[PDB]
Amino acid sequence: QFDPILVADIGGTNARFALITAFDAAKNEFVIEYNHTFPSADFGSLQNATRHYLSTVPHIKPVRACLAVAGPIKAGQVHLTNLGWHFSVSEFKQAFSFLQLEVINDFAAFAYAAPYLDSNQNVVIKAGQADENSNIAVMGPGTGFGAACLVRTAQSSAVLSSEGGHISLAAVTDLDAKLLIELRKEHPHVSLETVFSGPGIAHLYKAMAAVNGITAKHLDAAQISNLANTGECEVCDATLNQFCDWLGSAAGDLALAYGALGGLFIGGGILPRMQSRLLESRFVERFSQKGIMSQYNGQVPVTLVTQDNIPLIGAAACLHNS
Amino acid sequence: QFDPILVADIGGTNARFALITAFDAAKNEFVIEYNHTFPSADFGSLQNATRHYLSTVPHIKPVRACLAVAGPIKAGQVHLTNLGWHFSVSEFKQAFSFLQLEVINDFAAFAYAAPYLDSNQNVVIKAGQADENSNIAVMGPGTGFGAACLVRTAQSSAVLSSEGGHISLAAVTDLDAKLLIELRKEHPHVSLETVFSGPGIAHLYKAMAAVNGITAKHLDAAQISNLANTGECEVCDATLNQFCDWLGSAAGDLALAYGALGGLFIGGGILPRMQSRLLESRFVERFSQKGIMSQYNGQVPVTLVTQDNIPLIGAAACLHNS
């Protein structure tokens, strides 16, 4: 009989709670039940939010818990000053008499989750052959660019949390190069996140406009994607294709940096909205265009994550594999 | 009473064996004794080399062993076809009745070793504040460019082995940019290893010569370093300074990619021979020139490794921490 786990996805506008009630060895999937979302604004503390949630499912009183936090964890201390939630992992554990409590970052949760994803609920960007005994890379263009790695060796395993979104962005093509020169005019340091993010799409548009000899209007990502579709902004359509192309190069670099023969997953909320453009782009060609390591990246499967509960699956995987 | 460990550094022209006989909690150092080197060519198998070594120190019969291999480990199989040594980890363990045997890559050993280095036997490249609970990055420009990371979290730890030397090399300065254009003329894929390695120094020289409007002579790294010193090759001196400068940028990128708040170590045999030039270069300035993550890299201590037994210390740390 599986020992239930309380899992939570906190830090954003909405806090999400659920109960892990079983693990199916066949499907290699955690069974998640009683999935409840609520505005973080409804509570003055995480403790309160948690007490409320547990009161709605009192027949299952978990003594194991893991919270995935889209915020900073500095020495057993969590500060979501944004929400007004500040708590000690130690006291939170005490408050609910948890025998086991893990508090992890959201991308760390994405890395923990990687081996337990719904195969039939995701999109293969590039086939195909995963090495079960090697590392898995996870990345996600969103508000910023997050990158992490589930490190698996013949001695142990752990999750590499990083600031990999901030590494310098390299040029591969002549167009890349020209765009870096323009980008650097507004961004002394042009990193992955300078381009591969919600704000980055706007940055990339401004640069593309400049390269094409056009004064750029004040557009954000959604506006850029819309105007591209209606054919009212040629530079917008080219910007989004360049985004996909370049991303391929960056994803390939991270696959090498993280030795990701276990596979590379692309999450976040932006890329799943660009699925058709991504699959039509030069992403895959650029992904494995890596000199003597071309064959290596040729073997690495790249998957676009489409399921919605990654943080919860990760929290579950983290605590259960402790 | 410490349980002795047999440690070995194999794969190169010389095989090195030693015995770990104790661990000093105060110094935080493994005690290494009976350090013996011998030409790999003297034996037809690792088993033979090992039997010979153990016969010279028969009063200490270790049942724990860890081999650091500068070669490939594919599924409990080691193939140093170069030396004619091919063995099964399983059978090697059996052959010497080891209760515990770990076989790791050489850079993985460098990552394992990082926390146990001789503070007074290394050179601070950039101060200063290590976070004991964060990851440590290790890198080394040699024949190729190796990169690994000791991943340390509040849940576990592991060593990230990578192909990070093969990620695209980004330009930061105008000179960087011009050099990439030249480099790409001979190297379709310009990676870190294209520049930051023994062969890379020659590549960089050829490119620097071209940028400076000079026909480059056929020189290798040592020749480039020599001619620089005698002032017989101005472009050579500029090449080596550019190498150090650019390396700073690359090391900074890896520190971000690996979340290396625990520190970053630079090993290999090339950089320790360039200590004065390195410390006089723009390495440190470029290391932390990383936009919003500038403060982050400002905190990361960078150390030049000068001690000779890194692989042995790593093997020891790996097996002992199993």
Q: What is the DSSP string of B274-307?
A: GHHHHHHSSHHHHHT--GGGHHHHHH--EEE---
For residues A318 and A276, the answer to whether their CB atoms sit within 8 Å is no
Residues of A in contact with B249 (CB under 8 A): 168
CB contact (8 A) between residue B168 and residue A133 = no
Q: Contact at 8 Å (CB) between A176 and B176?
A: no
Asked whether the beta carbons of residue A163 and residue B256 sit closer than 8 angstroms, the reply is yes
* Phi-psi category of residue B184: left, alpha or beta, with phi > 0 → left and psi -120 to 50 → alpha: alpha
Environment class of B219 (CB within 10 Å of its CB; exposed 0-12, middle 13-18, buried 19+): buried
Which residues, other chains included, contact A293 with Cβ-Cβ below 8 Å and sequence gap of 6+? A256, B163, B166, B191
- Cβ neighbours of B106 (radius 10 Å): 23
Range 170-199 of B in CB contact (< 8 A) with A: 170-172, 177, 180, 187-189, 191, 194
The answer to whether B317 and B116 have CB atoms below 8 angstroms apart is yes
Cα–Cα dist B284/B303, whole Å = 11
How long a stretch of residues is chain B? 322
Distance CA B318, CA B322 (A): 6
The rounded distance, in Å, linking the Cα atoms of A84 and B240 is 52
Question: How close B1 comes to chain A (CA, Å)?
Answer: 24
Q: Which of A260, A213, A203, A205 is nearest to A233 (CA)?
A: A205
Greatest extent of chain A over all pairs of C-alpha atoms, in Å = 66
**Least CB–CB distance from B259: residue in A104, A161, A249:** A161
Comparing CB atoms, the residue among B151, B157, B289 nearest residue A189 is: B289
Structure tokens at A226: 């819309």
Experimental method: X-ray
Q: Does residue B211 sit at the A interface (CB-CB below 8 Å)? A: no
Contact indicator for A206, A194 with CB cutoff of 8 Å: no
- Strand partners for B17: B8, B36
| Per-window interface: B 56-75 vs A, CB < 8 A | 75
In terms of Cβ atoms closer than 10 Å to its own Cβ (0-12, 13-18, 19+), residue B312 is buried
Cis bond before residue A128 (omega within 30° of 0): yes
**Rg of chain A in Å (alpha carbons):** 21
Euclidean distance between CA atoms A159 and A162, whole angstroms: 10
Which residue does chain B place closest to A186, by CA atoms? B291
Q: Which two tokens stand for residue A87?
A: 């708590």
Interface of B with A in 5-64 (CB under 8 A): none
Comparing CB atoms, the residue among A153, A171, A257 nearest residue B171 is: A171
Show the tokens assigned to A230.
């209606």
Q: How far apart are CA B227 and CA B240, in angstroms?
A: 11
Q: Helix, strand, or coil here: B314?
A: helix
Alpha carbon distance A117, A29 (integer Å): 7
Q: What is the distance between the alpha carbons of residues A256 and A300, in angstroms, rounded to a whole number?
A: 10
Q: Is B162 on the interface with A (CB under 8 A)?
A: yes
* Residues found in chain A: 322
How many alpha carbons lie under 13 Å from residue A167 in its C-beta half-sphere? 29
Distance from C-alpha of B14 to C-alpha of A65, rounded to nearest angstrom: 52
Show Cβ contacts of residue A303 under 8 Å, excluding neighbours closer than 6 positions: A117, A122, A123, A124, A125, A263, A264, A265, A266
Q: The tokens 């950039």 sit on which residue?
A: B126
Q: At what angle do helices A234-257 and A174-183 cross, to 10 degrees?
A: 100
Backbone angle region of B75, left / alpha / beta, with phi > 0 → left and psi within -120 to 50 → alpha: left
> Domains in chain B, please, with CATH?
1-105+306-322 (3.30.420.40), 106-305 (3.40.367.20)
Sheet with B136-141: strands ordered across: B123-126, B302-304, B263-266, B136-141, B145-152, B157-161
CA distances from B13 to A213, B33, B83 (A): 58, 22, 8
Q: How far is CA B184 from each of CA A205, A245, B194, rounded to the nearest angstrom?
A: 27, 19, 10
In chain A, the N- to C-terminal Cα span, in Å, equals 18
Which of these, B250, B283, B264, B287, lies nearest to B149 by C-alpha position? B264
DSSP β-bridge partners for residue B168 = B191
Q: What number of other Cβ atoms are within 10 A of residue A55's Cβ?
A: 8
CA B121 – CA B139 distance, rounded (Å): 18
Tell whether B163 is within 8 A of chain A (Cβ): yes
Tell me the pairing of strands B157-161 and B263-266: unpaired
Q: At what angle do helices A310-320 and A106-113 cross, to 10 degrees?
A: 70
Q: How far apart are CA B137 and CA B260, in angstroms?
A: 5
CB-CB contact of B128 with B92 (8 Å): no
CA B262 to chain A, closest CA, distance in angstroms equals 12
3-state percent helix, strand, coil for chain B, nearest multiple of 5: 40, 25, 35
SS (H, E, C) chain A: CCCCEEEEEECCCEEEEEEEEEEECCCCEEEEEEEEEEEHHHCCCHHHHHHHHHHHCCCCCCCEEEEEECCCECCCEEEECCCCEEEEHHHHHHHCCCCEEEEEEHHHHHHHHHHHCCHHHCEEEECCCCCCCCCEEEEEECCCEEEEEEEECCCCEEEEECCHHHCECCCCCHHHHHHHHHHCCCCCCCEHHHHCCHHHHHHHHHHHHHHCCCCCCCCCHHHHHHHHHCCCCHHHHHHHHHHHHHHHHHHHHHHHHCCCCCEEEECCCCHHHHHHHHHHCCHHHHHCCCHHHHHHHHHCCEEECCCCCHHHHHHHHHHHCC
A310 is in an annotated binding site: no
- How far off is chain B from A10, nearest CA to CA, in Å? 19
DSSP string, B210-262: HHTT-PPP---HHHHHHHHHTTS-HHHHHHHHHHHHHHHHHHHHHHHHTT-TT
Alpha carbon of residue B144 to chain centroid: 10
How close, in Å, is residue B130 to chain A by CA atoms?
14
Query: What distance in Å separates the CA atoms of residue A6 and residue A47, rounded to the nearest whole number?
Result: 13
Residue ranges of alpha helices (H) inside chain B are 46-56, 89-95, 106-113, 174-183, 192-195, 198-211, 221-229, 234-257, 275-280, 283-287, 294-299, 310-320
Which helix (H) or strand (E) segment holds residue B6: the answer is strand B5-10
Q: Which of residues 255-314 of A touch B (CB under 8 A)?
A: 256-259, 289-294, 296
**For residue B14, what are its two tokens?**
């010389």
Six-digit token string for A47: 């403790």
CA A147 vs. chain centroid, Å, equals 7
A174 is in an annotated binding site: no
Q: How far apart are CA B192 and CA B269, in angstroms?
A: 17
Residue type, A242: Q
Which tokens in the block code for residue B137? 């990055």
Taking every pair of Cα atoms in chain B, the longest distance, rounded to a whole number of angstroms, is: 66
- CA-angle at B183, arms to B180 and B187, nearest 5°: 120
- Are A125 and A284 in contact, with CB atoms under 8 Å apart? yes
Determine contact, residues B290/B252, Cβ cutoff 8 Å: yes
Chain A residues within an 8 Å CB radius of B152: 158
CB-neighbour burial class of residue A263 (10 A; exposed 0-12, middle 13-18, buried 19+):
buried
Torsion of CA B274, B275, B278, B283, to 10 degrees: 130
Which amino acid type is present at position A139?
M
Let me know: does B263 contact B82? Beta carbons within 8 Å. no
Which one, of A290, A287, A285, lies nearest residue B166 by Cα?
A: A290
Closest listed residue to residue A248, CA positions, set A285, A273, A294: A285
Q: How far apart, in whole angstroms, are the C-alpha atoms of residue A42 and residue A206?
A: 39
Q: How far apart are CA B319 and CA B112, in angstroms?
A: 10
> Phi/psi of residue B186, each to 5°?
-115, -10
B7 strand-pairing partners? B18, B66
Q: d(Cα A24, Cα A316) in Å, to the nearest integer?
A: 13
For A249, the closest chain B residue by CA position comes to B168
Please tell me the distance from the alpha carbon of residue A220 to that of residue A288, in angstroms, as a whole number: 30
Query: For chains A and B, what is the number of CB pairs under 8 angstroms?
Result: 152
The answer to whether A167 contacts B102, with C-beta atoms less than 8 Å apart, is no
Q: Do A158 and B161 touch (CB under 8 A)?
A: no
Kindly list the residues from chain B whose CB atom is less than 8 angstroms away from the CB atom of residue A257: 147, 162-164, 167, 254, 257-258
When computed from its CA atoms, the radius of gyration of chain B, rounded to whole angstroms, is: 21
Q: What is the DSSP letter of B103?
A: E
Q: Which chain B residue shows the shortest CA-CA distance from A251?
A: B167
Is A146 part of the contact surface with chain B (CB cutoff 8 Å)? no
Min Cα distance B195 → chain A (Å) is: 14
Q: Could you tell me how far CA A276 lies from the centroid of its own chain?
A: 20
Q: Does A253 touch chain B (CB under 8 A)?
A: yes
Question: Chain A residue closest to B322 (CA)?
Answer: A155
Cα(B218)–Cα(B143) distance, integer angstroms:
18
A205 vs A270: CA distance, rounded Å: 16
Residues A194/A198/A202/A207 CA torsion (nearest 10 deg): 30
